[PDB]
Amino acid sequence: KHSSDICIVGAGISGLTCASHLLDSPACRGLSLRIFDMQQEAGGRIRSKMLDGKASIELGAGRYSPQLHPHFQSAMQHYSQKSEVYPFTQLKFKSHVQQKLKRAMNELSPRLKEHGKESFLQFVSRYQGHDSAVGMIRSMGYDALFLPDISAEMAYDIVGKHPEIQSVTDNDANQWFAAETGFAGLIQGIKAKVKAAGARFSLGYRLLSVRTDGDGYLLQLAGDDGWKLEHRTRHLILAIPPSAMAGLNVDFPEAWSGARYGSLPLFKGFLTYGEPWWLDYKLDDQVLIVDNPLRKIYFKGDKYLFFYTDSEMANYWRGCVAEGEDGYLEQIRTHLASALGIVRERIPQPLAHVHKYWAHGVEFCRDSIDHPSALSHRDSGIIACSDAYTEHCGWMEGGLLSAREASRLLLQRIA
Amino acid sequence: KHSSDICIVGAGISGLTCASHLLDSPACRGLSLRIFDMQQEAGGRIRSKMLDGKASIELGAGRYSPQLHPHFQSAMQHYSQKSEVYPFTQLKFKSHVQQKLKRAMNELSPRLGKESFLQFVSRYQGHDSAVGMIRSMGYDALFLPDISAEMAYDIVGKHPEIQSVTDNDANQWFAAETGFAGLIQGIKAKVKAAGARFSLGYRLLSVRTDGDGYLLQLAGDDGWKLEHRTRHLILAIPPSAMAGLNVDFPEAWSGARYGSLPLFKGFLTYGEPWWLDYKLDDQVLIVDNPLRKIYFKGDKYLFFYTDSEMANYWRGCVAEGEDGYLEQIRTHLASALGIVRERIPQPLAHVHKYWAHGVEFCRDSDIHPSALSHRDSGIIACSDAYTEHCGWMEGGLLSAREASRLLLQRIA
Numbered sequence A: 001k002h003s004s005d006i007c008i009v010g011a012g013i014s015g016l017t018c019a020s021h022l023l024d025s026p027a028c029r030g031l032s033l034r035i036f037d038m039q040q041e042a043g044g045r046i047r048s049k050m051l052d053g054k055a056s057i058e059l060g061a062g063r064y065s066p067q068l069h070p071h072f073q074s075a076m077q078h079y080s081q082k083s084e085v086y087p088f089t090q091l092k093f094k095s096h097v098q099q100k101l102k103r104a105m106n107e108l109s110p111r112l113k114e115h116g117k118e119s120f121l122q123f124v125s126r127y128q129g130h131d132s133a134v135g136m137i138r139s140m141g142y143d144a145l146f147l148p149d150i151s152a153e154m155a156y157d158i159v160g161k162h163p164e165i166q167s168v169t170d171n172d173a174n175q176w177f178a179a180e181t182g183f184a185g186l187i188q189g190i191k192a193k194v195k196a197a198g199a200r201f202s203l204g205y206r207l208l209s210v211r212t213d214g215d216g217y218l219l220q221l222a223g224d225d226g227w228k229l230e231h232r233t234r235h236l237i238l239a240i241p242p243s244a245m246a247g248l249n250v251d252f253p254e255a256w257s258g259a260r261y262g263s264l265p266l267f268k269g270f271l272t273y274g275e276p277w278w279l280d281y282k283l284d285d286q287v288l289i290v291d292n293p294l295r296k297i298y299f300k301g302d303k304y305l306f307f308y309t310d311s312e313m314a315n316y317w318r319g320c321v322a323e324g325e326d327g328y329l330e331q332i333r334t335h336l337a338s339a340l341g342i343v344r345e346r347i348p349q350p351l352a353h354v355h356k357y358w359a360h361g362v363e364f365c366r367d368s369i370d371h372p373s374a375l376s377h378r379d380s381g382i383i384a385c386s387d388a389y390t391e392h393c394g395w396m397e398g399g400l401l402s403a404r405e406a407s408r409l410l411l412q413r414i415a
Numbered sequence B: 001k002h003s004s005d006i007c008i009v010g011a012g013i014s015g016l017t018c019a020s021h022l023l024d025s026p027a028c029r030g031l032s033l034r035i036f037d038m039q040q041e042a043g044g045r046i047r048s049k050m051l052d053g054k055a056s057i058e059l060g061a062g063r064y065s066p067q068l069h070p071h072f073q074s075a076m077q078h079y080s081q082k083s084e085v086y087p088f089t090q091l092k093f094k095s096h097v098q099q100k101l102k103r104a105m106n107e108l109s110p111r112l113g114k115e116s117f118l119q120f121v122s123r124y125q126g127h128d129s130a131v132g133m134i135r136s137m138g139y140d141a142l143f144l145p146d147i148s149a150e151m152a153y154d155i156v157g158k159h160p161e162i163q164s165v166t167d168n169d170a171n172q173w174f175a176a177e178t179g180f181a182g183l184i185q186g187i188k189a190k191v192k193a194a195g196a197r198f199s200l201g202y203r204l205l206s207v208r209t210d211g212d213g214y215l216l217q218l219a220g221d222d223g224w225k226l227e228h229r230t231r232h233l234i235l236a237i238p239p240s241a242m243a244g245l246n247v248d249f250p251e252a253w254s255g256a257r258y259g260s261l262p263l264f265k266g267f268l269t270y271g272e273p274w275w276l277d278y279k280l281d282d283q284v285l286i287v288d289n290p291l292r293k294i295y296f297k298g299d300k301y302l303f304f305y306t307d308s309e310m311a312n313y314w315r316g317c318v319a320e321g322e323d324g325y326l327e328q329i330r331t332h333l334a335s336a337l338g339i340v341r342e343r344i345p346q347p348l349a350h351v352h353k354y355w356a357h358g359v360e361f362c363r364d365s366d367i368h369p370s371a372l373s374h375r376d377s378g379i380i381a382c383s384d385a386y387t388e389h390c391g392w393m394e395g396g397l398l399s400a401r402e403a404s405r406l407l408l409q410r411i412a
């Protein structure tokens, strides 16, 4: 036996793109390439489903901007994937609370040269105190902004990149699209191309440890039916995120970067009904940001509705799922009712629903000193590859950037 | 608050039947009952699938006998599950060694034994000749040293394909018509309607005694850490999963020692039933080559079933690539029927399943209780591996009666 020239652990968008660059290179003519992923389907945090077979939903990544994510758009085009307009870029009720924050973030703006290391909360509290800063930050519907490990300078960035709140900063001309059939369509297209150029996949295997071994490396993997397996290879990319790196045999992060990394969890839930009852309220294609636990509420045409939350509120919803389905559904009815200013009895019960919880939905770096796109083990020559090593940490575009640099460091290992 | 009065970990046939007996009991009125299992669906080593919209298949347990398993045959009827005749009760195309096989088994049966069946069967016959005839029976457990020659005659006599090699050719074999999934769903529906709550997809990592009750660590299959407090606790899991836990198994439970061996099944559907041309439907061939047992089910499909070292052989091919695995099957099919490879079609669809611990058993003649109790904490462990019927669903039912009785005791 079980052996290869090059091995990529991780069949997310980073690892699949790594494989695509390598196989396009003359200097790999004739080499063998093996790809492992601990899951049954490629994709990582890209996961499309069919909700009640009536419409495609995105349990993971769902949106991209041509302004922010041009390599991603070019990937969509190269693989003939249809894009559709993403509507949730405005509010039917931008509150004065929001436009106050627009006015207070621009007012406060010329201070981040000196103070931008402070937490975003500690920052905004300098305008109209702290109770007013909480009401303003909370109206943006992304509870990660309260975390002390989120600085003020990196908060202004977060706000400008997300489509619901991007007009609070002068980043409002950006456009947004979604895959018309599901982002899994792109994943399958790259996967087919890499397979047809001779790669071989072993989906369902988890890497456990790795030891350097002469000129190559010996990897210990475990199948999800318990079958133990050993693989030998001469060149190794780990296209996994930092949290998974930290639980391996290598010296991460000390011997790799120096910097420290964190992560926050994400939760999304979708509900279908027999009738599109929100059309009477003129809510199709709209998004509401509320202070109750659903945080962001989305109505998608005829088709369905969903909510999307993060950090402490993600953990809240996943506790309800653990206390039982009825009750989870029933607290959605309560909070939907108050978001619309009506009584629980006007909100029907769903036919079918789906949810997903990501223990490490988004992983980021906690510095910047100039951090490179992909990393290299100080001692063994293993290469790491993650969205979390780029300026686009938290976005698919970040995966494609790190893949290009990572696949270039390994090309020079090969000459 | 995340807690219960009673907790059962394991939603195989043992765990669900444990829950079924408890909710039937008057002494459990008022009390709360929570069932965990690490899989997303219930049934353990019972697993029914649909290969092609055509037919349902058994990735795990597939057959029972009314004579050998009266309680299982009774569960089927208590839940109104239709049965069907299991055809693979006869080796219609015997090989030379089959004929000698009945004769030597009745011939060696005097010798009192408890020794490894390979060394024994080669005591009164040539060693290279014993390998020839043991292997004609199609189950490579029979070559393991950890299996006595006593154990081996009990194995030959209870499997539908070689039972006529003993004076047991008169047992009947049945399969489920819609799959044993239908028996699992029946018990699950009952236990849920009496008010039990399922947390499927959670895996128990450890357990700690805590005052009068116990405190459980669980991990969801998406990472969510969980803690559950209960007062009474059944662990309806096999020994191999007892060993990976917080508790001192087996040292502090039985003082016996247990083993296991792995199993593999593979199913193939085609465009046209090419095997009828050989008068081969509803028939089973035992061959020497890696497929070890080849079954032909009417028009619908063929499969193969192997154990122990051959089970690892096939799981190996799978890890080297789906293609070529299919080509191994196609080479070995050709030698089994004695034709060239190019006459054997490739299949439309196929499914396989590998069971790292397919069957687990006890290594002793400890005249083995049906369920166990932890000397100190009062935790009860439930498994087919503790009974005379280990490796059979009937043992899960028997271990369940006992485990729920030891618990109903302690509740008063």
Ligand SMILES: Cc1cc2nc3c(=O)[nH]c(=O)nc-3n(C[C@H](O)[C@H](O)[C@H](O)COP(=O)(O)OP(=O)(O)OC[C@H]3O[C@@H](n4cnc5c(N)ncnc54)[C@H](O)[C@@H]3O)c2cc1C
Pocket (backbone or CB within 6 Å): A009, A010, A011, A012, A013, A014, A015, A036, A037, A038, A039, A043, A044, A045, A046, A059, A060, A061, A062, A063, A064, A205, A206, A207, A208, A239, A240, A241, A244, A266, A267, A268, A358, A360, A361, A362, A385, A386, A387, A393, A394, A395, A396, A397, A398, A399
């Ligand atoms: C809720 C949510 C919403 C999102 N929304 C957006 C959005 O709208 N726009 C956008 O651009 N991005 C979004 N993202 C991010 C997007 O999912 C990208 O894929 C992500 O930024 C990085 O992809 P990746 O290939 O680097 O890593 P991953 O997709 O995380 O892939 C890593 C893979 O390696 C595998 N793996 C890990 N560890 C091991 C091991 N020890 N052995 C073997 N195999 C292993 C994993 O199974 C995984 O498949 C969202 C993410 C989440 C969770």
Ligand SMILES: Cc1cc2nc3c(=O)[nH]c(=O)nc-3n(C[C@H](O)[C@H](O)[C@H](O)COP(=O)(O)OP(=O)(O)OC[C@H]3O[C@@H](n4cnc5c(N)ncnc54)[C@H](O)[C@@H]3O)c2cc1C
Pocket (backbone or CB within 6 Å): B009, B010, B011, B012, B013, B014, B015, B036, B037, B038, B039, B043, B044, B045, B046, B059, B060, B061, B062, B063, B064, B202, B203, B204, B205, B236, B237, B238, B241, B263, B264, B265, B355, B357, B358, B359, B382, B383, B384, B390, B391, B392, B393, B394, B396
């Ligand atoms: C290939 C194969 C063929 C078979 N053919 C037959 C046959 O024809 N006739 C027959 O009678 N029997 C057959 N069997 C055996 C039959 O499947 C078993 O005897 C019976 O199902 C065992 O029931 P059980 O509840 O004791 O254990 P299991 O079926 O093993 O259920 C145990 C459950 O505990 C769960 N679990 C384990 N550990 C943990 C943990 N730490 N946390 C949470 N949950 C946990 C598991 O997910 C599992 O669901 C076959 C088995 C195999 C593998």
Ligand SMILES: [Cl-]
Pocket (backbone or CB within 6 Å): none
């Ligand atoms: Cl996002």
Ligand SMILES: [Cl-]
Pocket (backbone or CB within 6 Å): none
């Ligand atoms: Cl069996």
